[PDB]
Ligand SMILES: CCOC(=O)c1cn[nH]c1
């Protein structure tokens with residue numbers, strides 16, 4: 526069974542929920558997901574986890590010491606350490622398929638200004654490290670990106686190109702709008718053709734990059 | 742004050758949590774977020790929300806009569822309707838900035854196989870509709886994508902290029918590794934030039950597509 530550990534200063538936010546895809550996986554016994562409060566590894570009364578950046582700039586950077594103790598306790602040399610960040614290598618469907626065979630994923634959630642770089646540098650001396658982006662926008666912390674990665678990966682676990690065109694179900698006419706009649710005909714070959722053409726025009730319009738063309 | 746309505750068959754999973762950024766905004770009174778269970782608008786005892794695809798194929802497609810009623814109740818002509826889908830236009834930082842000044846966002850979460858296309862086509866005749874992808878991977882449903890979109894938009898509400906390089910804070914030395922000396926130099930022109938070169942090298946290595 527696969528084990529996923531998540532580390533965050535917002536533990537309530539990432540606590541697993543029974544009625545969800547990861548919730549079902551856990552219940553089928555196919556995965557163990559544990560959430561850890563980063564503040565468990567702090568010593569001071571005020572339990573501080575970040576500080577102003579060396580060299581100046583906005584916001585705060587998470588301290589290396591606290592992350593060091595957390596990952597020392599949670600990770601082994603076998604661990605794949607996942608770190609969401611706007612500056613990461615791209616997380617894609619290939620990435621999801623690959624991670625779906627892993628024994629132990631640890632996901633380190635940190636603020637967007639970053640965890641002190643020495644943390645990832647240190648971890649890399651003992652385990653495989655993957656800093657990754659799920660897309661080109663900014664989140665305040667890695668938490669929401671962790672939830673996307675967990676969804677993408679777990680649905681590919683055993684036992685759990687081109688854009689898709691429009692899809693339709695009953696009734697065949699609704700508010701004066703009809704389902705494309707080819708879909709009603711039962712001709713497998715004609716239906717395959719119409720769907721291919723629909724996918725072509727959608728991909729060219731919305732995602733020309735996928736077909737090897739310049740973006741808008 | 743911004744209003745966000747989220748429509749889903751997984752209401753617990755999407756319930757706001759106090760200990761989060763969206764939870765802070767809500768308690769600060771900068772947004773009101775409302776989560777609705779789609780099953781509220783079903784017709785039968787089974788609370789059916791999908792049905793087999795015309796033309797055949799795997800998976801199921803969400804019913805137009807059910808989503809139709811739900812959006813009639815929730816949306817107004819001022820609504821910007823958001824539909825996460827792998828087939829969408831890309832959601833980017835530019836998109837988040839645009840939506841951050843909207844009065845009413847409604848986010849329709851469905852399974853990845855899709856919602857009957859006539860729902861969006863119908864809605865687009867009396868309100869603004871945006872189908873968007875948050876990245877090139879497959880989720881079972883739009884729920885996690887909605888959390889990401891809400892996160893990116895809300896942090897841009899008042900009150901709540903190249904890649905960024907490495908960042909550092911105290912202590913100066915840790916486990917045999919020193920913060921790069923130039924950052925403690927007090928030469929802020931040189932610091933900006935060093936950070937630009939770090940950004941350039943990191944972008945070459947991790948995202949060469951951005952050049
Ligand atoms: C630490 C925050 O991380 C992000 O904002 C992100 C991750 N992927 N895309 C954006």
Ligand SMILES: CCOC(=O)c1cn[nH]c1
Pocket residue numbers: 825826827851852853873874875876877878879880881882883884886
């Ligand atoms: C309705 C399911 O939505 C997705 O799978 C998705 C959205 N953006 N990237 C993937």
